[PDB]
């Protein structure tokens, strides 16, 4: 009931207030709790989601990418970020598929290295809005898992309008697979895991990296693990291994500023759960 | 074009049913129509918006 925030500000700051509002409604839709949340609130929420969308289109550069300011250099992460929030909202409000495919098409033709590595040339000013991907270490594996995961949440939407999308998917997915075994941060393993699970030894790696077999935590900011454990939770559901899911989910339940990613991922994980199991 | 008919079959059921489920299905159908300048697109989007404003789905 706190996740309903009225979006405003520039390209990035508008998404920070839009994110909670979009996932809030998302969750309530999948778990169908609107009756328990407030049955009359859903509209005012959608209206707000409609406002943020629009307020965001204004920060859409000619090349279909995004940034805080029209004058600012486009950002690979934000562009990718807009993509996933928006791909999730095609069931909440009106979304121009041209905008989503336009942004996905850019994220490939000019942000994916010749070897399936998506790169960030113009970082977002609000580094806190990007969850654990902020952790410099293992940036290529991480930022590539993030973009990919978005492109996956945008497949159905732009699968018929983007030619490169499928080739970009495979060329990306391998990079993570070729270097999956060489990962020490649960986060990168947790995020890229879901990344891969979306398409043997790797899979055994995805488990034994989980402390206590119920959380992908790493020696730092807990919020990062919340995110980490979430991507991973979605990883499980992709393989329907509802076997070890109970713990993970149980640990999440027993778990503002800088909470953009966790708020998004956590509720999306706990959502895809209520749906898949 | 199938996608408009689909979107049509989705919006009609939503107008009658008026639920959170039918709404998700109707909005996505319309969004799936990739031709933005289609008029059956804006028209069908209108019916969506009209139910949301005067109704409480589900």
UniProtKB/Swiss-Prot annotation, chain A:
The chain holds residues 1001 to 1286 of 1663 of the full protein. Changing residue 140 to A: No effect on binding of C3d to CR2. Changing residue 30 to A: Impaired binding of C3d to CR2. This is Complement C3d fragment. Changing residue 159 to A: Impaired binding of C3d to CR2. Changing residue 121 to A: No effect on binding of C3d to CR2. Disulfide bonds join 101-158. Changing residue 160 to A: Minor effect on binding of C3d to CR2. It comes from Homo sapiens. There is a cross-link at residues 10-13 (Isoglutamyl cysteine thioester (Cys-Gln)). Changing residue 161 to K: In AHUS5; leads to impaired binding to the regulator CD46/MCP and resistance to cleavage by factor I.
């Amino acid at each position: 009931k706190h996740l309903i925030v009225t979006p405003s500000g520039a390209g990035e700051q508008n998404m920070i207030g839009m994110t909670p509002t979009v996932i809030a409604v998302h969750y309530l839709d999948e778990t169908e709790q609107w009756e328990k949340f407030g049955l009359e609130k859903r509209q005012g929420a959608l209206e707000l989601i409609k406002k943020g969308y629009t307020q965001q289109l204004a920060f859409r550069q000619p090349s279909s990418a995004f940034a805080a300011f029209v004058k600012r250099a486009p950002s690979t992460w934000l562009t990718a970020y807009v993509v996933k929030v928006f791909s999730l909202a095609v069931n909440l409000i009106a979304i121009d598929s041209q905008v989503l495919c336009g942004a996905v098409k850019w994220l490939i033709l000019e942000k994916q290295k010749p070897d399936g590595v998506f790169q960030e040339d113009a970082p977002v000013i609000h580094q806190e809005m990007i969850g654990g991907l902020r952790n410099n270490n293992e940036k290529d594996m991480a930022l590539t898992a993030f973009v990919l995961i978005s492109l996956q949440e945008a497949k159905d939407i732009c699968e018929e309008q983007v030619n490169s999308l499928p080739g970009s998917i495979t060329k990306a997915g391998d990079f993570l697979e070729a270097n999956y075994m060489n990962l020490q941060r649960s986060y990168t393993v947790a995020i890229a895991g879901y990344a891969l699970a979306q398409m043997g030894p790797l899979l055994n790696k995805f488990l034994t990296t989980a402390k206590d077999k119920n959380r992908w935590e790493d020696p730092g900011k807990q919020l990062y693990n919340v995110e980490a454990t979430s991507y991973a939770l979605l990883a499980l559901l992709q393989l329907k291994d509802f076997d070890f899911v109970p713990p993970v989910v149980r640990w999440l339940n027993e778990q503002g500023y800088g909470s953009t990613q966790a708020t998004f991922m956590v509720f999306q994980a706990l959502a895809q759960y209520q749906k898949d199991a | 074009n199938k996608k408009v008919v689909d979107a049509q079959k989705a919006v009609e059921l939503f107008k009658r049913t008026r639920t959170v489920a039918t709404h998700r299905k109707a909005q996505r159908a319309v969004n799936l129509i990739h031709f933005q300048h289609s008029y059956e697109k804006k028209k069908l989007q209108r019916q969506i918006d009209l139910v949301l404003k005067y109704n409480t789905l589900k």
